[PDB]
């Protein structure tokens, strides 16, 4: 069982017999959400030395993240009011960016590799695009489903397999991230499990047994890239989707 690293264990506990209060209780998932919140709080509270203008070396990091997500959501929705949807496009980044660096620490735990939470967050953003689009643009919201000047005898086909791609968008956006984080962690644990039993046979294998160690180091080098790039790709697709929902093509 190489997948035991994702087990959810209850720690602080709470129960009753009147009402099902077992929904909220401090758990491994919940404790790592508390840790994510305290890290994100720590990146801005004690980072700023006594509210100085000059912005010490720690604040350049949270300066660059801010600027690379402003200049990304200005180039996507880019209309009359792009900044009204900027806090959500930033707080969808920082959760995924911090929750995929915390998960790299060896005896730790991936928030992002729970499909039930990430798929739920994706369905929340998809319904919050459809409701916002219907509210802002009435019955002509469905004009999104015809591409451009197209010949009329093939328009209903191009409507059906446009709407099918419109509600595949509900689960695709989440399952991309879930699949990347889950496959990366499962790859690292399985190769560690193979190189461990590689190094317990006869003593000639601990000699020149440095090359599988170097391969695992190279995969860990790759895994930060595949963890930060997904945190960026989430925040670019849910900027493009707000471009479609707010502005009709």
């Amino acid at each position: 069982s190489p997948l035991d690293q994702f087990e959810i264990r209850t720690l602080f506990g709470l129960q009753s017999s009147f009402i099902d209060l077992s929904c909220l209780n401090l758990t491994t998932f919940s404790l790592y959400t508390i840790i994510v919140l305290l890290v994100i709080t720590s990146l801005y509270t004690l980072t700023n030395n006594n509210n100085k203008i000059i912005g010490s070396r720690w604040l350049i990091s949270q300066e660059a993240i801010y600027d690379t997500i402003m200049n990304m959501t200005k180039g996507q929705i880019g209309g009359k009011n792009w900044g009204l949807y900027f806090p959500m496009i930033f707080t969808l980044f920082m959760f995924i960016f911090i929750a995929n660096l915390i998960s790299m620490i060896p005896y730790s735990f991936a928030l992002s590799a729970h499909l039930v939470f990430i798929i739920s967050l994706s369905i929340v953003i998809w319904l919050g695009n459809t409701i916002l689009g219907l509210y802002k643009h009435g019955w002509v919201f469905f004009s999104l489903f015809v591409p451009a000047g197209t010949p009329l005898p093939l328009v209903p086909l191009l409507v059906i397999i446009e709407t099918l791609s419109y509600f595949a968008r509900a689960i695709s956006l989440g399952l991309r991230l879930g699949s990347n984080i889950l496959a990366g962690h499962l790859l690292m644990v399985i190769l560690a499990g193979l190189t461990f039993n590689f190094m317990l046979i006869n003593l000639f294998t601990l000699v020149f047994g440095f090359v599988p160690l170097a391969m695992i180091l190279a995969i860990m080098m790759l895994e930060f890239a595949i963890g930060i790039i997904q945190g960026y790709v989430w925040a670019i697709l849910t900027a493009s989707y707000l471009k479609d929902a707010v502005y009709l093509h």
């Binding site: 919140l37 203008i53 806090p87 707080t91 959760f95 967050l121």
Partner: protein, 48 residues
């Protein structure tokens, strides 16, 4: 897969959405404008 289908669905989703609303209110009202105060201050000293 066995590990991502327990009874803990409402646990996961409850603390997750509490953290999302928390970070949303928290970022938007606190931490983004404390960077933007730095921006407007730097530009105000620059324009003088």
């Amino acid at each position: 897969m066995p590990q991502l289908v327990p009874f803990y669905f409402m646990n996961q989703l409850t603390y997750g959405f509490l953290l999302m609303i928390t970070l949303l209110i928290l970022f938007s009202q606190f931490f983004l404008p404390m960077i933007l105060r730095l921006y407007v201050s730097r530009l105000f000293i620059s324009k003088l």
